Amino acid sequence: MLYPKESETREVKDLSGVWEFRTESDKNYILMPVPASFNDITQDINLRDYVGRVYYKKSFFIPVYWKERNIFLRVGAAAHFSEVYVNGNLVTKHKGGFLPFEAEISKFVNYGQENIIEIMVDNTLTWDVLPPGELKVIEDEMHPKGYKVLNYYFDFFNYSGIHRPVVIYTTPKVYIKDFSVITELSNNSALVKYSIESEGNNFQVILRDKDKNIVAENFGKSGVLEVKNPKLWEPGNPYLYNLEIKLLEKDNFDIYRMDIGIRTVRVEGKQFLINEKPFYFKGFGKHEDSDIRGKGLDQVINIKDFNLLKWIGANSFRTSHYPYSEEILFLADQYGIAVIEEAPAVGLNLWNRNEKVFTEGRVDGKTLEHHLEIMRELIARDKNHPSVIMWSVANEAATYEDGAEEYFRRVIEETRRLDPTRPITIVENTKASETKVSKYVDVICVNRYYSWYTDSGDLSVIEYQLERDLREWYELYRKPIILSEFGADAISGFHSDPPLMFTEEYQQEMIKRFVGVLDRLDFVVGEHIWNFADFMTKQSITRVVGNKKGVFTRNRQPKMVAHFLKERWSKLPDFWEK
Template sequence: MLRPRPTPTREVVNLDGLWRFAIEGSAGPCPWAGPLDTPLEAAVPASYNDLFTDAAIRDHVGWVWYQRLVRVPRGWAGERVVLRLDAATHQGRVYVDDELVAEHQGGYTPFEADITRLVRPGGEFRLTIGVGNELTNTTIPPGTITVSQDGRRQQKYLHDFYNYAGLARSVWLYSVPAVHIDDITVVTSLDGTTGTVDYTVETSAPATVRVRVLDATGTEVAASSGANGTLRIDHVTPWQPGAAYLYDLVVDIVDREAVVDTYTQPFGVRTVEVRGQEFLINGEPFYFTGFGKHEDTPVRGKGHDDAYLVHDFQLMKWVGANSFRTSHYPYAEEVLDFADRHGIVVIDETAAVGLNLAVEGGLAGRPHRPTFSGETFNDDTRTAHAEAIRELIARDKNHPSVVMWCLANEPSSHEEGAREYFEPLVGLARKLDPTRPVSYAAVMFATHHSDRIMDLFDVVCLNRYYGWYVATGDLITAEAFLEGELRGWAEKFDKPILVSEYGADALPGLHSVWDTPWTEEYQLAYLAANHRAFDRAEAVVGEHVWNFADFQTSNGIHRVDGNRKGVFTRDRRPKSAAHALRARWTRLDNRKPRAAD
């Protein structure tokens, strides 16, 4: 699925703004059958939960409804008219006037509908979008719904971030010719100073295809014809971390000499490889520095915001970060486009967070249900998970910034049934994209002794909190535990190790002369202890602090207005830890630090 872009043969109308808004039950049995009877308006893109003061809206479990009138440009006569949603969290239904035109399950990937037969150029139609936030044992991410004694439906979930919902990303109307380009796939490699570009073009009907490669100055450097083939770029400029260089693949459908449709796909020429205990980009060892992040800001929730996008990337550059993980779901496409242009490396993750009932048992202090079973996470769950992988790779396959797929965060990989669940998913990811390594982020319960699936993956990604959840306040013990485990994973699997999460909560302005958890000083000391262990473990190829910024979570007595592990506050002010990371990371230059540094 190509992202909507204006071209000489395509036009795009952005439908962001204020929409009529109502929750289920307040707008009649068929909210799409006429104008919404509501005084409320909601911003798009934004999560709806924090927009209003009514707790019944914030805590609503079920469907909500967005509606607006849309006018089709009168110049679109003879064109196909397509409606696209960048995301609807977690389920979407789309109605043009009274007719259902699209349904989608999964809250972070796009879907669209050809609505040509239902609209007319110059005419107006009523667009109604239903968004459901319900999570069950067969959704990705999973959850359960309970009913309180007074009849209120309540959503329970296993991920430690607030379950924001709504239209958090843009909605578009766009036109394409009757015969048009449906999809483009670009795979690159390097042969000395020559770049090779394998391309595949899918069209809506048999057509004559012509392709050209333009460099950053707009100069044509390669050309070919046919719907698939290989292009060679002499004296290529590779895409590199911190030094992004993008080419344009211009694809035309032609009829004789007339261009029927044209689309420009940016791409970078680079290679990714795992060799022994090294992670290589363009054949050179790469050391990840950066964060797990969240799409999370005040008021907007998970709503995409270009101002925060720019500022967050500026802060990552300031602190010396070269990478981040899209924890714990695919981020907005604008984020990956920005990373492509600015040379930031991305680990791209599905929304499979919470596939772990051992966490549920640990928090409750009682034996837990088996994570993988017919009654818990089962074949239907895996089917939804597989679709999430398909949609992630289909959307993000052409981004040079994306160097690895992360299939899940903290699944119960040490439990019986984990291998039967994950082995087909790893095979699917490799089939869909054999060019990128595949990983998952392992929970602390899964050690190198007990984990059942790590041999299926390319990189050992570990979420480890020695000194916070284990050996709390005892950093001498924590450092020894961590180093011992890192060496255990390296000896057993002989693969690169990325510490994909490590962190400690800190309340800004809370200080102590002792190692007191929740203070800024303890967060500093915690990070330093972890870094000493990383630097002594040869197989470690990167460190992603949890988290870039404080973020909102569900209600819980173990959280103080959300998760406070950010090195920046939720409104992006640096804690002391941010300055310490800057001192460490700005001198590394993508290199592995040495223990003596």
């Protein structure tokens, strides 16, 4: 499914705005913005911590002239289970809170009249949705009848609601359903190879440069476009060409356009190559999180975040720990930021080797089935973005378990089959010698928190422990390694010398000592600090109103270590043969 875009042949109507909202088995509505998480909008603590079904409702008018058009209703994201009703008719259901879903609804609309859309969203986690969790009953001596808790083991808050825009769009009855683009370098040219999915068959395809000059054209539902003297897309030079696809049939006419970038990505030895040059990742793990709206899409915050990425000198980030909005990937295309996009397989770990995760009752064949469908949906959505340069299949799963090996072999095999054009990783906090899964990926991503979660407060252990660990990863697997997470919680304004945990000084010193180690290791091709910004988590005595490891505050202002990273990364080239 293609991102909804207006053209000569397609209308788009955005239903974002103020909706009516209620919780299960309640008749009274309140007002609720869309897109947004509902948790922080009100002062009702029982809604903040609500677990169950909520219902959104809105009126909309369909123009009579949309008859004899396809009418699609698209929901960008709703966490985690959703059902969509048009005038009381169920038009689609969806499982998974971080990818879009849509249905054709012309059969159910009142033309030239009022219509009602209702969207049910259920935030109840189970062990066969990603990320997983479990609702548990607690009726003991200290809890009243009916006390229940939603348990989950990922470290970000279970925000719920409609997190990305709801839109209605039209197409002709015979229309461009999808297309695939692959770019190759050939002699002094680039090739853009394409295939179009449609019931139609007569297509003209045109490629235009930045100045609207036509640089290539082809008649054909599949084909190759040759670009002589191409300008390649890469961090530091985000050149985009505009691909125009025109269906020209007897009764149907359809146009779809997308900006694409010409680049190659390849792993060879201990090098991560973009356009055949050795890349060095400088960046962050991020989160879709901001004040008040929770996980809701906000283009103000998105553009602010990319300007901060360019300001600090980052060239990349990982979409920890789930696919982000398409909007963020289009921006990464424009700004020239390399993206590792990650499936929502986070929380597959009970920090305890006595509780097994990959076992009947928890992560099983049903979870695997969902994970495989997720990879198919994710690659289908994002396969044409130049900014996505790697897929991450999971974050900190219990990869030391025997059952994790067969599980992830299947996930990894399916991902590569779906997209052979990008490398694959998995983000590990398991010990190097214990993971049964990292031997199957292209690039190793390791999260390490020496002197924070272990030997807390003792910065002196970092060089000893980190160098020994990373050398063992390389000795066992002989793959490029990204230090995919490291950092320390810092309360803005907490200062100390000597540095103490939770101060800005400790965060900067820890990060500084980690990267001094990486500079001595020629097989380390990247550093991603956790996290870009402070974000909300569930409440616990270990979380000082959320996770405070941001390099920026939640309102997008820098802590001390942001300036250290700006100075370091201004000296580090994007392409660096270590």
